[PDB]
C-alpha cells in the first residue's frame, strides 16, 4: 500500500471538472484521495480507501487511475527512464455536472427536507449516463483519511446507519414500479393490435380472476362517468382498473415479451458498474397479471431500468447500451479508450413508441405542473407503488419517469423517492415528478 500511494493516482471527472483526485502530502503514503464534492458525485467515484478498498469507479476503473493498466504500461517506462514523477491515467465520465447536481438538490430539498432514493438521468439516442444520484449519500474523504480511525469510525457509521448511505439505489435496489410500468402494459396491447382508442372499464373496482382479491382505482372512484373510457384516457387519469383488464386482455405472454423487450429479465451489461436485474416476475395465475400490469405483484425495476423504458420510448423504440464511462486518458491526457454508443435493441416499433411518447405527453398534463418548464413538452408517466409486507399501510415509492422535449428528446430521467418522504400521502406527482422536472430542466439549458 505505501507503494500504490507513493504514486498520483489519476483523476475521475465530469465535465472537465474533478470529481476524485490525488494530492501530495508529506505523509508516510504520499497521496491523499480527495473528493471536492463528496455526497453529490460519490453514486460515481465510490471511494478509495487504505483500510477498505475501493468501490465504484474507483474499483471498476482501478488500473487505470493507478497506472497499471497494460494501455498505460509504455508511459509507465518512458516516467521512469526520464526521471518523471509517475502518475495514473484519467477516467472521464459521462456524468453532466449540472444535472447531477440539480439532481441531488432537489432530492435534499424535495421532501420537505431530503429525499431518500434515486435519480438517474440518460441521453436517449447515446445511451450516456448523464445523472447518477442516490440520496442518501456518503462522504469519501471519510474513508479517503490515512487515519485509520476516522476510516474505521466512518465505516462502523455508514453500516449501522439504517438508511445505508453507501448504497447506490439507482443501480444496485429494485423496486416496485407501480403506475409507471403501465407504460409497459400499453406497449404490450399497442403491439397486439389495440389502440389509444380502445374501450376499458371505468368501475372503481375490479375483481382479479381466481381470488377474493381486489383492485381499486385511487381512490375508490370510477375513472370517468362512463362505463368504459379509452386507453389514452385512462393511461392520462392513471386508473388501475383500466390497466388490470387491459393486461389480463393483453395476457400473460405478450406482457412477458414487451417487459423482456423493454430490458427486463435479462442480465444487465455493466456500465462498467453493475447493475442489479430488473424483472416482471413469474406471473403465476391470472391474479398476479392483474396485479404486474399495474406494477406490483413481482415486478421490481431499478431506477437506472426505468429511465432506459423512457430513454427507448424517447429514441423511437430503440435501446442504447447505457454507460458511464466516456473515455479513459493516460496521463498526458492521451486518449486511451473511447466509448461508443451501440443499440442494445429494439423494444417497439417506431410506431408503438410514437403512441406511447403522446399517451405520456398527455399524462404529463394531467400530473401537477409544480416545476413545468416554460415552453417545454414533457413526456412522462407518475407512479406511486406499494411495497413490503404491510402494503396499505406503509409510505409508497414515488416514482416518475419522463423524457424531454417529447418532440426531439435529449433527456430522459427517472425520479425514485423511496418510501415517498416518509408519508403516506405520498404520490409520484407531487415528490418524484417537479424533482424530475428540476434534472429536465438542468439537462436543457
Ligand atoms: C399506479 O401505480 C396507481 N397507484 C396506485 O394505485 C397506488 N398503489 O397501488 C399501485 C397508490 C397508492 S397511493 C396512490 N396515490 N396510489 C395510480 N398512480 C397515480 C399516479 O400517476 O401516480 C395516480 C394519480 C392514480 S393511482
Redesign the pocket.
Known sequence: LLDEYSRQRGQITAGGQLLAYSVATDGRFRFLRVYPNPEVYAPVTGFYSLRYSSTALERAEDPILNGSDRRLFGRRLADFFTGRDPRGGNVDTTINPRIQQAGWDAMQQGCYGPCKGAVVALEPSTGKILALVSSPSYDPNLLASHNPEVQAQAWQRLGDNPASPLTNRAISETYPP??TFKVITTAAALAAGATETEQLTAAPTIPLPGSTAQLEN?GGAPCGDEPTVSLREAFVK?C?TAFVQLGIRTGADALRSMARAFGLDSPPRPTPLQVAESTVGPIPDSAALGMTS???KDVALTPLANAEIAATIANGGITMRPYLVGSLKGPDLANISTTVRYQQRRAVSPQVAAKLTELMVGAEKVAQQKGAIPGVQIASK?????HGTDPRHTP?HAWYIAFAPAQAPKVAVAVLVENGADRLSA???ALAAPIGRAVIEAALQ
Open positions: 407501480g403506475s385511487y392513471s388501475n399495474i406494477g406490483q407518475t407512479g406511486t407503488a406499494e409508497p404520490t409520484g406527482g
